[PDB]
Protein: Capsid protein
Amino acid sequence: DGVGNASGNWHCDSTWLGDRVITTSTRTWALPTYNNHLYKQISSASTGASNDNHYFGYSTPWGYFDFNRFHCHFSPRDWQRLINNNWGFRPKRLNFKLFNIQVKEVTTNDGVTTIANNLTSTVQVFSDSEYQLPYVLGSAHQGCLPPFPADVFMIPQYGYLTLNNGSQAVGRSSFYCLEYFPSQMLRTGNNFTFSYTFEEVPFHSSYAHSQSLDRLMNPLIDQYLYYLNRTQNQSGSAQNKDLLFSRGSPAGMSVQPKNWLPGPCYRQQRVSKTKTDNNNSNFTWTGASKYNLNGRESIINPGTAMASHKDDEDKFFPMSGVMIFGKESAGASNTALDNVMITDEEEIKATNPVATERFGTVAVNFQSSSTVPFKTDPATGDVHAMGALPGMVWQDRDVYLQGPIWAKIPHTDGHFHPSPLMGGFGLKNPPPQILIKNTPVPANPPAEFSATKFASFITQYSTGQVSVEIEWELQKENSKRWNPEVQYTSNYAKSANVDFTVDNNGLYTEPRPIGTRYLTRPL
Amino acid sequence: DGVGNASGNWHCDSTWLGDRVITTSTRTWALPTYNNHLYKQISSASTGASNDNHYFGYSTPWGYFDFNRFHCHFSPRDWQRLINNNWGFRPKRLNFKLFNI
Amino acid sequence: DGVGNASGNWHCDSTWLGDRVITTSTRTWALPTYNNHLYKQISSASTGASNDNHYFGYSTPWGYFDFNRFHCHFSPRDWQRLINNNWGFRPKRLNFKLFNI
Amino acid sequence: DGVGNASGNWHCDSTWLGDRVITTSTRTWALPTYNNHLYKQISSASTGASNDNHYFGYSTPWGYFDFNRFHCHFSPRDWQRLINNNWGFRPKRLNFKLFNIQVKEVTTNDGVTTIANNLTSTVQVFSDSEYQLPYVLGSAHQGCLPPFPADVFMIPQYGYLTLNNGSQAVGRSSFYCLEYFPSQMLRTGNNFTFSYTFEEVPFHSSYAHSQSLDRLMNPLIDQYLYYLNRTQNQSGSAQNKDLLFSRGSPAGMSVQPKNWLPGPCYRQQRVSKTKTDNNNSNFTWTGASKYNLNGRESIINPGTAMASHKDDEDKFFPMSGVMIFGKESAGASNTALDNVMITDEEEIKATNPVATERFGTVAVNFQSSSTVPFKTDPATGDVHAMGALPGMVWQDRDVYLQGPIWAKIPHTDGHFHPSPLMGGFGLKNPPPQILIKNTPVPANPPAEFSATKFASFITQYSTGQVSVEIEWELQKENSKRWNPEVQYTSNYAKSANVDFTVDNNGLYTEPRPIGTRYLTRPL
Structure:
């Protein structure tokens, strides 16, 4: 629409209707030139990694837009308003806009850098609406819109992995040229818009359960069902066998017949947040729950949605069963427990097994008396990994303000309960990837013709504004609970700083991860 | 249409209909100044070639656009799809666009 | 329709439409008399098998028609054409005819 | 239409309209069971042939219907009527009918054979209208409808050849199941009909030329064009060079400038019908014109349409340049000149080179005088194979009453003048092959099930009637010639037999091959 006319406005807001909330977020992005406009083949051959870390793939000159975290859309106040008042929520629709494009030319001479406007340069943008590209969103990568609307963010580079045999490729390894797509070319007066509708996904549960699964009975009335209570005489003067049956009573609630089972489990190793109680070894790889796929092992991390610990055991967490967010000023490698924030799944103890303990015990032999004068005592074994049994009920992992929103469900023949293990909404057709790059501008060509492809380019980057608007459907509480509920609250106390704010240096920080499960409902 | 408005989009695709295939290819080109905007007469007199290699002609300051190879239009996957499934093929029509100068 | 009039024709073909393929297969069958027209009770008692191989059942004088293999319908060329070009497939409908008894 | 109702009538006739002739022919055929209903792979590996005779292919249990000879449709009287009166002819349309099917069961016990009717058996018939099968018609094979309408003929077996590397196959070697086609199943009351329209093919030339190509001038008037006549002095007292030019005159007609050239040639070896004048060696393979294809040689036979001999040289014929028909009582191998009938192409001497002589001479050097004191005499060389030059004109090979009618033009990128070298009409879509076989009837199956495919069949054959009706378009003579024309005639003389009749044993014989070129027209 011209050089001197803005192609969009700043739309950062949150509107709460009766059963919907619409969150709008605008951010300022910077997109550099990646790979010098080259597609590069990347692998682990030069890295010299272990067999488990081998890979083969490609690095493209494109960047992508990521808004797959909840704090890209919700302020902490909006998140608190959602989680303190709603029993569930899900996304309905989204709008994406890209506007106010500025391409900047950079020249460095004698150490000093000049930046100018390039009014005739373009950025190519396209949305992969048919999911023809590898989906790298949903792997919890950096590069999302920053939580604070004042922050300017760099656009992450696009790259993918394909089938590999060690550090080598195979015949079925794919290569994707992203220039083989129709792109919209944007000069400084152009904008880009894109709408998307979410499929009907189940509401995420912003509630805990007020009852436990093994405590669903009337505590005053007996049962009409009997169970075997004693196989020996109760008197004890003699030690004779018997078959004595008792009625299901509130005195013994552990032996009452029940209708349902706790969800599946895959036991993790128990690590104490107090380092002195941990074994003096590494055991982060040798003692960890991992799966085998094509000969190379992968840590589960976090796997099945299970309770982090029991009651009065907050000092323990599963070794790779929890989502760990880093605070600002946390290093990339071997940072400290003080620099990370470990989440807790304490609210799903009502239906899910504890992550660090067995599902239960199982009979492993036939008990018998002496006759065949070889008496066989009954024997049980611990069940550490339990798959889905009929009658099982469970809760999924919680979502966090700092955590992912959705994940693409793999296009496979079968999948069981396709809810992402990091938490969120599993979508068969997720929001498509928006891919953006600067169109290469060649430098001065030679006077004589050369068929060698161009390698000298004018160095430039681009900047602009991006808006994402998501409509979310809410599921209101309808509780008849009498006593007040647990709510997420700010701490009232004199503190050097306010939580979820900037410091005197201007650095936005999030003190803690906030989940969703504060309200309760009966099981 | 203006300095700050793009005059075209990137159209690089391949659509397979029942009996047609439409291949679109977009590329970025650089055109220099040739001959310092001069028409020059060229021959083999200074070259001193053999009688079989003698020539006379002209060099113009113009360049030309060439898309007379099959890989300018078909990806290797598209070529494989064509040759593994079709008994024959021929070209029907073409569109040429030059944009974002 | 009579002794000297054929009640069907040989339909063995494969037609490829845009998103469908219709496979037709005709075969010549011979049906004998089974069990001398008797229903017989069969088990493993005379066989003297292991506990894992014990069975009890019945043998009827009937035969049955089976076309539950893919090569009853696809030639190897048709199978190659399907698997080299399609991401998936499934069956929609079938017709069965028995003729020229 | 029933067991006791005939499904067709005998239609054997010839109707002459003004510019059309419609020929109908009915014959009685017998079709056996071929290969025991099996498809067999055939090659030359067991034969142990030479590299030139190697092949790989398949034998099917099907037979085919062939009516690709002119005497399947024309009686000798009709052929004479056509060739004595028409300047050209071509086929317009055809109808094919198969009727009065009878399947017969055969049992041989103790040496005696019983034949019964099988009223419930079928013959499968289909027409290959899309040319999806190898076309084995047009190779001049036996198995056509017999010339005499009273003769009962056996249906030939279908088989084809595919790509071979010696006696082996290759990856691109094809296999065709003919049961993979839709067939019509015919019981004894059913019939089969099929119509076909010929493409617009040029008329075959039933004429000779009254003029020769080198004699197209006015014999009374000179030319206005000059030619170099002498390069030496005419007087002869001295032997000096000169440049003397003469005018084109009727005195020298060989040196007159002309407008056209004789057709292309590919020289053949000259064999005398009188065996004493031939060289004492075999030389039927070592001294023969042959072509090289994929490393194996093939005799041309007959190749380019050229004159068999010159004037007053009827004793000579090209070694493999003539169509040779065998008389009845001619052996399959090494039969006698008395048992074969050699055709003659004497009528196309007006435009075509003689098959056994060179096309002409060509200059092969530069003539010069002594100076460089190395005088160079002019030198010419004989041109034995001449391809098409602009200005060339030629006639095609003649068709015969015993010869083929059409041939399928190979589906190739290029072809030059696609007229078959044996003579006839080259058709891109020729009349399709009609393929017929007896449906297998299994014998008594075992009491217990066996998945081994059936190998025991009830032995049977079939018989029936076949009708072919072809409409031909005629091209009438419009001649202004005064003297009477040469006509094909019967010889008037007392003879022991009549030509083109049966003998006292009932054997139909054709005494001679009859061509078409009797009428004449100016060149």
